[PDB]
Every structure is written in C-alpha cells, then in structure tokens.
DNA sequence: CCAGAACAGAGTGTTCTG
DNA sequence: TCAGAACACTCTGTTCTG
C-alpha cells in the first residue's frame, strides 16, 4: 500500500525528522531550519502544497512541516 | 519615484511596453519564450512584491500580461 | 533505515554592452 | 533610450556515503 508524504502528498521515502515524508521535504525542512527563517506567503497562508506546487510557497511548505510535527531531534 | 508596475520594486525604465524593473523584464521574456506551465497554489490573486514575486510565477506572469507587456 | 553530504539542474536578478 | 548576453547567486531534489 502507498506511503504518502504528510507535507506534500508525494510518495514518502520513510520517517524523516519524526514524520513520514518524501526525500524533498526531508531536505527542505533541514534547510529551512538552518536558513534565514524569514519566509513570506504571497497568498493567505493556506497555499496548496503538493508535488506540483510545493516550490511555489516555502512559507506554507515549512508551516506544514511544523504542523506535521517535524523536528531536528527526529522525535516521533 | 520610478516604481515597477508589476512588483512595485524600483523600476529601471520601460521594458517590453511597460515601466518595470529589470527582474520583471527578464522574467517576462523567459516566461514567454520558455514554454512553462505555471500554476498558482493560491486563488490566482497572489501579492506580487519585491520579495513575494518569486513565489508565484503564474500570478507574476498574469500581472505582466495585464499591464500590457508585449515582446514588441 | 535514516541523517547529512554532494552533485546537478532550475529559477532568479545583476552587470555589461552597443 | 532599452534588448539581449552572460555571469552569479539562490532554491530544489536525487544519488551517495557513513
Ligand atoms: Zn513531501
Ligand atoms: Zn503560502
Ligand atoms: Zn518588477
Ligand atoms: Zn498566485
């Protein structure tokens, strides 16, 4: 049965930083947590984040990472 | 003075028919030539400003067209 | 199996030129 | 005048490595 990234709904590769995610959201989260952490949404902070649109809004992608429970300590 | 009609950034001059910055100038050219299928993650109403213009090419491109940008 | 590094490509914006 | 080239920099996602 299918394993689904809890952030962008792409096929998940495994449990990364505590949450079932794809490889691209894994490394996106690590980069967001180590980066400028100044993200702006051009929308309403509800942007659709899927395989097609996840590049559009780093702010909403990162919000969904946090909301899903991702953390660098990789606590479940 | 001198404001980009697309993203509100300081405008360099009149490009492809409209007063725009350089980033919007080259973005528009790249978009017209460049095949792309742009899709808004929003409502097709995105805020386009100096930082936010990067987020939504679809809305940036739409504003470009609606402002009258033309390859001549 | 998973974190992190490394690699390569896409996207963006500036500088320079005539 | 502004269009184009091209350089330089950021963001992304897959493949490697430990
Ligand atoms: Zn994902
Ligand atoms: Zn958003
Ligand atoms: Zn602009
Ligand atoms: Zn949009």
Q: For residue B35, what are its two tokens?
A: 């095949």
The experimental technique used to determine this model is X-ray
Q: What 3-state DSSP class applies to A20?
A: strand
> Quick one: how many helices (H) and strands (E) in chain B?
2, 2
d(CA B45, CA A48): 14
Phi, psi dihedral angles at B23 (to 5 degrees) = -60, -45
Q: Which residues touch strand D (CB under 7 A)?
A: A 22-28, 31, 35-36, 54-55, 58, 61; B 12-17, 25-26, 29, 71
Q: Beta-carbon neighbour count of residue B65 at 10 Å?
A: 12
What is the structure's resolution, reported in angstroms to one decimal? 2.0
H or E stretch at B18: strand B18-20
Given CA atoms A35, A21, A13, B42 in this order, what sign does their dihedral have? negative
Q: What 3-state DSSP class applies to B52?
A: helix
Which structural domains are found in chain A, ordered by start?
1-76 (3.30.50.10)
């Amino acid at each position: 049965p299918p394993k689904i990234c809890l952030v962008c709904s792409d096929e998940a590769s495994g449990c990364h930083y505590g949450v079932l995610t794809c490889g691209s959201c894994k490394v996106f989260f690590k980069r967001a947590v180590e980066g400028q952490h100044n993200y702006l949404c051009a929308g309403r902070n509800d942007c659709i984040i899927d395989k097609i649109r996840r590049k559009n809004c780093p702010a909403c992608r990162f919000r969904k990472c946090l909301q899903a429970g991702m953390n660098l300590e990789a606590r479940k």
